[PDB]
Each structure stands twice: as structure tokens, then as C-alpha cells.
């Protein structure tokens, strides 16, 4: 197991999940497979506390589980749950997860491009510049709202365009460690007497 896989798992779990998930995953990182009862005793978590965490790691399929059965010293049946990290599904799911963020970020960027510019202070409704000919009233010489029969403003449209870019842009700047980690992880038996001599008396 390359250290890059271990580091990738540690970075993503610590980056987007609680320390409980990281500590639980660290055990599966330190040892490829560990029993649920062992992880329970090591973490000292409650059953539902650990199981819910494990269910999350199961939800994103970062970990896999197999059941092993054996007979105890007294003869009673025993069934232990062995959990293990699946770097293959982990890297696949994180790539999907990040590709989904990219689609969401692209959607947020496209929204930042489509956001309405004109707006009404009465109903707090923002109108796209396409409506400008409908909003502008020549009797008044200015933009007005049909629902509020009141002035419609436009100059405030710079604020949403600038502000959204600040939040969206920083996403790519901070994800750089995961992207780098991803780029780094894309890869005797003699004849008898009767056959030896003449048995005829002569």
C-alpha cells in the first residue's frame, strides 16, 4: 500500500469528516483489516456511535466488511465483523465526489453569469436585463415594478457578480493537496523361473 493512498485517505477524511471518522479510518489505515469489536474497544466508542460512523464509511464505500465465524473455547458460535479499507472504491468515489463538486461549481458559475440585474426594493424581486424594456416606463422615464408600481434599481447588480466569484474561486485553491495526491495516485521385476527355463523334462 503506497503511502500516497494512506495520505489521500487521511487528508480527505480529516478535510471533510470529523475526527471520529479520521480516527476510525486511521485504524483501518494502520492495519488493513481490524475487527469491529477491536475498533470499538480501541476507540472506546459506543456501538451506535461507531456503527453510524462505519455506516458513513460504508455509505461512501471507503471501507469494506467481511464476516468471519469460529467456535469459542466453551463451544459457543462466534461471528466477528472484519472491516477493511478499499482504496479502489475510495479513489473512485472521491473522484466522483470531486467531479460532482466541479459540476456544482460550474452550475454556480453559470448562475453567477445568469443572475438578474434589475431589482425592486418593495417586493425584493430581482429582474433580468431582458425585462428592461418591460420595466422601463416612458411615462416615468425610469424602470418600475409591475407588481409594486414602484421604482426598480439596476446599479446594485455588481455586488452579486463580484461576491460569488470570491467564494467559488477559493474552492480550487484549497483543494490543491487532494488534487496533487490524486495526480500522484492515478496509477527388480525379473522374469519368473517358468519363463526363464524349459519346464519340459528334457
Amino acid at each position: 500500500v503506497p503511502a500516497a493512498l494512506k495520505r489521500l485517505a487521511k487528508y480527505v477524511i480529516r478535510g471533510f469528516y470529523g475526527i471520529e471518522h479520521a480516527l476510525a479510518l486511521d485504524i483501518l489505515i494502520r492495519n488493513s483489516c481490524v475487527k469491529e469489536e477491536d475498533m470499538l474497544e480501541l476507540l472506546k466508542f459506543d456501538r451506535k456511535q461507531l456503527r453510524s460512523v462505519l455506516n458513513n464509511l460504508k455509505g461512501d464505500k471507503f471501507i469494506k466488511c467481511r464476516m468471519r465465524v469460529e467456535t469459542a473455547a466453551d463451544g459457543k458460535t462466534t461471528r466477528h465483523n472484519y472491516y477493511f479499507i478499499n482504496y479502489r472504491t475510495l479513489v473512485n468515489v472521491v473522484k466522483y465526489k470531486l467531479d460532482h463538486m466541479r459540476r456544482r461549481i460550474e452550475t454556480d458559475e453559470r448562475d453567477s453569469t445568469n443572475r438578474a440585474s434589475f431589482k425592486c426594493p418593495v417586493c425584493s424581486s430581482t429582474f433580468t436585463d431582458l425585462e428592461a424594456n418591460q420595466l422601463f416606463d416612458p411615462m416615468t422615464g425610469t424602470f418600475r415594478c409591475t407588481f409594486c408600481h414602484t421604482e426598480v434599481e439596476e446599479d446594485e447588480s455588481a455586488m452579486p457578480k463580484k461576491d460569488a466569484r470570491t467564494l467559488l474561486a477559493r474552492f480550487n485553491e484549497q483543494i490543491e493537496p487532494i488534487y496533487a495526491l490524486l495526480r500522484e495516485t492515478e496509477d527388480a521385476k525379473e522374469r519368473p523361473i517358468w519363463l526363464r527355463e524349459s519346464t519340459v523334462q528334457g
Binding site: 466541479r102 458559475e109 445568469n114 457578480k161 474561486a169 483543494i175
Partner: protein, 149 residues
């Protein structure tokens, strides 16, 4: 493909080589994810440099070096001038003499202002547009077709 990408959207470039970077007069790497924002405000202004663009002025390019992008764009423009053929000069120095200043102009234009460059280009255009540019256009297009063939 190997480069990180646009100063903002440096993520799809690693995924596939089908997506290509776009060059602009500002010599800035841009693409749809960033370009869509440039139309909602300013309508053709470089994000970091602020320089305005007369139109979209976007062209497909697959060079990671923005200096080469500019230099090629500049080269392609400057080749319309000073490109008179060798028979025009009897002396060996002349064959590459103007090429020196031309290469200086092309190179310097990648960093310095085009004020003196455009003035010199215009001052020579007033003379070269009469005959040599008319003649070299034919010879250049002819030899270009010979290079294609």
C-alpha cells in the same frame, strides 16, 4: 493537459486533453468556466489584468507557454511586414538585417508597449504597402502552398 490550467479553473485540464486553452490579446489563459464570468461583467475584460477585449478575441491554442502564444500571435501579424524576398537584397547582410529588428520588435512586443513598434510599422507600411507587400503577398501565399504541397 499537463499544466494546472487557468488561475481559477485548474481542474478539468488534468482530466482530459480534449479541453484546450484559449489565447487572447492580453496573453492570458482562459476557458469557458472563466470566460462565462468575463461576459457577465465588463464584457471582455481580463480577470487579473483588467485589459479590455474589443470582441471575444478567443482562439484555440495548445501551448503551455503564454509567451510563445503571444510571440506566435505577434509573429503572424508582423510577417505581413518586412517579409520581402531575398532577390530584393544583393548583400548577404540584408537577408537577415531586417530580420534582426523584426525579431526584436516581435520579442519586445511580448513585454514592451507597441507605441514605437506601431509607429515604425506604420511608417514602413506607408512605403511597403505600395509594391513589396503586394508582391510578397503573392510569393508568400505561393510558397505557403508549396509548403503545404
Amino acid at each position: 493537459m499537463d499544466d494546472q490550467g487557468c488561475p481559477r479553473c485548474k481542474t478539468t485540464k488534468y482530466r482530459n486533453p480534449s479541453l484546450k486553452l484559449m489565447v487572447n490579446v492580453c496573453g492570458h489563459t482562459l476557458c469557458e468556466s472563466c470566460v462565462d464570468l468575463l461576459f457577465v461583467r465588463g464584457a471582455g475584460n481580463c480577470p487579473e489584468c483588467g485589459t479590455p477585449l474589443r470582441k471575444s478575441n478567443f482562439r484555440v491554442q495548445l501551448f503551455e507557454d503564454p509567451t510563445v502564444d503571444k510571440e506566435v500571435e505577434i509573429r503572424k501579424k508582423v510577417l505581413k511586414i518586412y517579409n520581402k524576398r531575398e532577390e530584393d537584397f544583393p548583400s548577404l547582410r540584408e537577408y537577415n538585417d531586417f530580420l534582426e529588428e523584426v525579431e526584436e520588435i516581435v520579442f519586445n512586443l511580448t513585454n514592451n508597449v507597441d507605441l514605437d513598434n506601431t509607429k515604425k510599422k506604420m511608417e514602413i507600411y506607408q512605403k511597403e504597402n505600395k509594391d513589396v507587400i503586394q508582391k510578397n503577398k503573392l510569393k508568400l501565399t505561393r510558397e505557403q502552398e508549396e509548403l503545404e504541397e
